[PDB]
């Protein structure tokens, strides 16, 4: 408190949090439940990555 | 249809044709260019006016 300081840890964290790579895309082939929970995501990500209408394509860009 | 004729020697057989139609396919393209300054200052976060 006694001094404000010259930088904001909040801003530094939030500005880095936008430069970390996207995680990997796993696919469990040992449990049916996880297998489906990942294939659902696979189809959602294809849609989001190839549908012109949305801006999410341009974001994944 | 067909007309039934008498003087014609053998009565004309009724007619049916098979017609096979094909569907053409046409593909369409456009190109839009976008700058990395936009694609970056978008991922960043605004804090000041």
Swiss-Prot record, chain A:
Name of this chain's protein: Triplex capsid protein 1
Originating species: Epstein-Barr virus (strain B95-8)
Location of this fragment in the whole protein: 1 to 61 of 364
Family: Belongs to the herpesviridae TRX1 protein family.
Chain's role: Structural component of the T=16 icosahedral capsid. The capsid is composed of pentamers and hexamers of major capsid protein/MCP, which are linked together by heterotrimers called triplexes. These triplexes are formed by a single molecule of triplex protein 1/TRX1 and two copies of triplex protein 2/TRX2. Additionally, TRX1 is required for efficient transport of TRX2 to the nucleus, which is the site of capsid assembly.
Subunit structure: Interacts with TRX2, MCP and capsid vertex component 2/CVC2.
Compartments, record wording: Virion; Host nucleus
Curated annotation (Swiss-Prot), chain B:
Superkingdom, natural source: Viruses
Localization of this protein: Virion; Host nucleus
Assembly description: Homomultimer. Makes the hexons and eleven out of twelve pentons. Interacts with triplex proteins 1/TRX1 and 2/TRX2; adjacent capsomers are linked together in groups of three by triplexes, heterotrimeric complexes composed of one molecule of TRX1 and two molecules of TRX2. Interacts with scaffold protein; this interaction allows efficient MCP transport to the host nucleus. Interacts with capsid vertex component 2/CVC2. Interacts with the small capsomere-interacting protein/SCP.
Family listed: Belongs to the herpesviridae major capsid protein family.
Role: Self-assembles to form an icosahedral capsid with a T=16 symmetry, about 200 nm in diameter, and consisting of 150 hexons and 12 pentons (total of 162 capsomers). Hexons form the edges and faces of the capsid and are each composed of six MCP molecules. In contrast, one penton is found at each of the 12 vertices. Eleven of the pentons are MCP pentamers, while the last vertex is occupied by the portal complex.
Protein name: Major capsid protein
Organism, scientific name: Epstein-Barr virus (strain B95-8) (HHV-4)
High-level lineage: Viruses, Duplodnaviria, Heunggongvirae, Peploviricota, Herviviricetes
């Amino acid at each position: 408190m006694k001094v404000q300081g010259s930088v904001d840890r909040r801003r530094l964290q939030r500005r880095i949090a936008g430069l970390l790579p996207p995680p990997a895309r796993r696919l469990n082939i040992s449990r049916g439940s996880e297998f489906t929970r990942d294939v659902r995501g696979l189809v959602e990500e294809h849609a989001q990555a190839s549908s012109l209408s949305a801006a999410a394509v341009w974001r994944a860009g | 249809p067909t007309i039934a004729h008498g003087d014609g020697r053998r009565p004309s057989k009724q007619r049916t044709f098979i017609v096979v139609k094909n569907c053409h396919k046409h593909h369409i393209s456009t190109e839009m260019e976008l700058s990395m300054l936009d694609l970056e200052i978008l991922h960043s976060i605004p804090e000041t006016p």
